[PDB]
């Protein structure tokens, strides 16, 4: 059947996702991030 022949060939087309710009998202940190080498702390003297 021609209709079945068209369907079999063009049936499997994965969808497409459209996410706009300016959207809010998260990042869920998957590992321990160590900032010891790049920052250090010091106290600001009073007044």
């Amino acid at each position: 059947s021609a209709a079945a022949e068209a369907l079999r060939n063009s049936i499997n087309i994965p969808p497409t996702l459209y996410k706009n710009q300016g959207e809010r998202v998260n990042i869920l940190v998957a590992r321990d991030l160590d900032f010891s080498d790049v920052y250090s702390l010091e106290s600001i003297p009073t007044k």
């Binding site: 459209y18 706009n20 710009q21 300016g22």
Partner: peptide, 28 residues
């Protein structure tokens, strides 16, 4: 038939200045 939505377009009615006061980064 169906097309991707556009992001919100802001209304063009309540147009006001951004700068109520001169910034300090201009040093004024």
């Amino acid at each position: 038939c169906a097309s991707a939505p556009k992001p919100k377009q802001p209304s063009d009615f309540n147009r006001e200045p951004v700068n109520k006061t001169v910034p300090v980064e201009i040093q004024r």
